[PDB]
Amino acid sequence: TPEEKLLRAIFGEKASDVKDSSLRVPNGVSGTVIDVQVFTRDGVEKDKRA
C-alpha cells in the first residue's frame, strides 16, 4: 500500500529480498533437544554443519 511505502520513505529501511521462513514451533511445548540429524546431498556441498 502507499501508506507503507510512505513509511518506508520516511524511516528508510531497504527490506531486501530475504524472507523470514525459519523453522518455528507453533505454540511451542518447551523442552530439551536430544540430537540433530542432518541429511546431505551428493551434488550440493554439505557446508560445515555435519
Binding site: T1, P2, E3, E4, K5, L6, A9, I10, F11, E13
Partner: protein
C-alpha cells in the same frame, strides 16, 4: 442381410448400455474380404478419382485461376517459399525455374491459341471442341499435389454453390409466388437458357393461375440479371455445368461407397491392433476412435502400384495416431510430445540400467552416457509426476477425506486488516495535524486518497510550474516527520 441374427441377439439383451459390446455387435455384420478382392475396390477408387479429375479438366477457367495464382506467386521477383512446393510436381505414367519455363511456355501458348478461337463460328463448334479437348489432354498431363488441388476443388465448390444458390433462389421464389409446375418449368429452363423469351411465352399462354405475376416481375427479371452476369463472366451453358457436376458427384460417390466398404470390413483390424495398446494411459474407447481416424487417414493415402498389403502400410499410421492420442493430454496438465519422448527414453535407460547393475538408477551415469547435463536430468525427473486426486481415502472410516489439512493463502489475517485500518486513521491524523497544503501534497503525491499517483510533471502542470520547490517541500516534510514525538504511535508499526 444379417438383421435376423441381430434381432435374436437383442431379444436376449436386457438393455445393455455399455458401448463396447454394442460396437462389436454392429461391426460384426461385414465379414472378412479376400486378398485380391480389394483390387476392384481400388480400381473403383481410380475410376472415381479420374471422373472427378475429368470434371475438373472440362472446367475451362481452372487454367485461368491456376495462371492467376501462378502470377501472384511469380509477381514479387524472388520466391522459394512453401507455397511453391504446393504446386504440380508431375508424376510419370527438386523444382527449378528453368524446367518451369520449359514446361509452361507451351502451356501459355496453348492458352493464348485457345482463348482467341472461342468466337470463331460458334460457342460449341466442332473444331473448337477439338481444341478444348486438346487443351484438356494437355492439362491432364500435369497434376497437382493435393493441397492446391483440393484448394481448386474447394474454389470450384464455392462457384458451384453460388450458381446453385442463385438457381435455387429463382426456383423457390417462383414456387412461392406463382406456384409453377415442373412440366412447364424444366423444359423452358433446359431449352432457352439465355433470354426472357420463355417468360414472354408464359405470358402469351393464358393460364389463369399465372395472373399473380405482375407484382413479382421486378424481382423475377432482376434475379436473372445475376445469371446474365455469371454468363458474362464465364461464357458457359447451364446444362454442361450440370452434367459436369453430376459426373463429379458420381466420381465422389463411388469413392465414398468404396471408403464405406473399406471401413466396414476393416474395423476389426483396428480393434485387433488397438486392444494391445491399452496400457492404462486413458480409457480405450478414445483409442478405438483415434484408431478409426487413423484408418481413415491411411485409406485416404493408399497406393495400388506398390503390390504390398494394406495392413503393413496402415500399421504405421494407426500407431502414429495412437501415439499422438496417448501423448496429447496424458495427464491433467499439458506436456509436449518431445518431453514425453525424452521421459520414455530415460525410463527405458533407467530400467535397463537397473536390470544390468542391480541397484537404483543414479542420474550421474545417465548424464555420462547420454552426454546430457545433470541439471537437465534433474529438471526432467522433477517435472514428470502425476497429480493426486481430491478424495484419497486414508482411513478405514468414511470421515477422513480431503478438504482438510489444505489451506488457502489468499484469505489473509484479520489482525493485519485491523492494523491497516488503524494505520489509515493514524496517517489521517498525521496529515490533519500538519499544514493543510502539506497534507494535499502528501496525498496527491504518492496516491493517498486518489486513484493514480501523479508524476512530478503532472504535479507541475496542476499546482505550480516550479518543481524544485516541490522537492524542497518534500524535504521539509521529511524533516518534520523524522521527529519521534509526532511518530511515536508509528514506531510500533515499523516492524510490519
Amino acid at each position: 442381410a444379417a438383421a435376423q441374427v441381430l434381432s435374436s441377439v437383442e431379444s436376449e439383451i436386457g438393455r445393455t448400455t455399455d458401448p463396447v459390446r454394442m460396437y462389436m455387435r454392429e461391426m460384426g455384420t461385414v465379414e472378412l474380404l479376400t486378398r485380391e478382392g480389394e483390387i476392384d475396390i481400388a480400381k473403383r477408387i481410380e475410376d472415381g478419382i479420374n471422373q472427378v479429375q475429368c470434371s475438373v479438366a472440362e472446367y475451362p477457367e481452372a487454367i485461368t485461376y491456376l495462371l492467376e495464382q501462378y502470377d501472384r506467386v511469380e509477381a514479387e521477383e524472388a520466391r522459394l517459399s512453401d507455397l511453391i512446393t504446393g504446386f504440380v510436381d508431375p508424376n510419370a505414367e527438386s523444382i527449378d525455374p528453368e524446367l518451369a519455363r520449359e514446361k509452361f511456355a507451351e502451356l501459355r501458348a496453348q492458352y493464348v491459341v485457345t482463348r482467341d478461337t472461342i468466337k470463331a463460328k460458334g460457342r460449341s463448334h466442332a473444331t473448337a471442341q477439338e481444341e478444348i479437348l486438346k487443351l484438356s489432354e494437355v492439362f491432364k498431363q500435369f497434376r497437382l499435389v493435393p493441397k492446391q488441388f483440393d484448394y481448386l476443388v474447394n474454389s470450384m465448390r464455392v462457384m458451384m454453390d453460388r450458381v446453385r444458390t442463385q438457381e435455387r433462389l429463382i426456383m423457390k421464389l417462383c414456387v412461392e409466388q406463382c406456384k409453377m409446375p415442373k412440366k412447364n418449368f424444366i423444359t423452358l429452363f433446359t431449352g432457352n437458357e439465355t433470354s426472357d423469351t420463355w417468360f414472354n411465352a408464359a405470358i402469351a399462354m393464358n393460364k389463369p393461375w399465372s395472373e399473380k405475376l405482375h407484382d413479382v416481375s421486378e424481382e423475377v427479371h432482376r434475379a436473372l440479371q445475376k445469371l446474365q452476369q455469371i454468363e458474362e463472366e464465364t461464357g458457359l451453358t447451364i446444362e454442361q455445368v450440370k452434367d459436369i457436376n453430376r459426373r463429379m458427384s458420381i466420381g465422389e460417390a463411388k469413392a465414398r461407397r468404396a471408403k464405406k466398404e473399406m471401413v466396414e470390413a476393416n474395423l476389426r483390424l483396428v480393434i485387433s491392433i488397438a486392444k494391445k495398446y491399452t496400457n492404462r494411459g486413458l480409457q480405450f474407447l478414445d483409442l478405438i476412435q483415434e484408431g478409426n481416424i487413423g484408418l481413415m487417414k491411411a485409406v485416404d493415402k493408399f497406393e495400388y502400384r506398390r503390390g504390398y498389403k494394406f495392413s503393413t502400410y496402415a500399421t504405421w499410421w494407426i500407431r502414429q495416431a495412437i501415439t499422438r492420442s496417448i501423448a496429447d493430454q496424458a495427464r491433467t496438465i499439458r506436456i509436449p510430445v518431445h518431453m514425453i519422448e525424452t521421459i520414455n527414453k530415460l525410463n527405458r535407460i533407467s530400467r535397463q540400467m537397473l536390470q544390468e547393475m542391480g541397484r537404483e538408477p543414479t542420474p550421474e551415469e545417465l548424464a555420462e552416457r547420454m552426454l546430457m547435463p545433470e541439471d537437465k536430468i534433474r529438471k526432467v525427473l522433477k517435472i514428470a509426476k502425476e497429480p493426486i486426486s481430491m478424495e484419497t481415502p486414508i482411513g478405514d472410516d468414511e470421515d477422513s477425506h480431503l478438504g482438510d489439512f489444505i489451506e488457502d493463502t489468499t484469505l489473509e489475517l484479520p489482525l493485519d486488516s485491523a492494523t491497516t485500518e488503524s494505520l489509515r486513521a493514524a496517517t489521517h491524523d498525521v496529515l490533519a495535524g500538519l499544514t493543510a497544503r502539506e497534507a494535499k501534497v502528501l496525498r496527491m503525491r504518492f496516491g493517498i486518497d486518489m486513484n493514480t499517483d501523479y508524476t512530478l510533471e503532472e504535479v507541475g502542470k496542476q499546482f505550480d510550474v516550479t518543481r524544485e520547490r516541490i522537492r524542497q517541500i518534500e524535504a521539509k516534510a521529511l524533516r518534520k516527520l523524522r521527529h519521534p514525538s509526532r511518530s511515536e504511535v508509528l514506531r510500533s508499526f515499523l516492524d510490519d
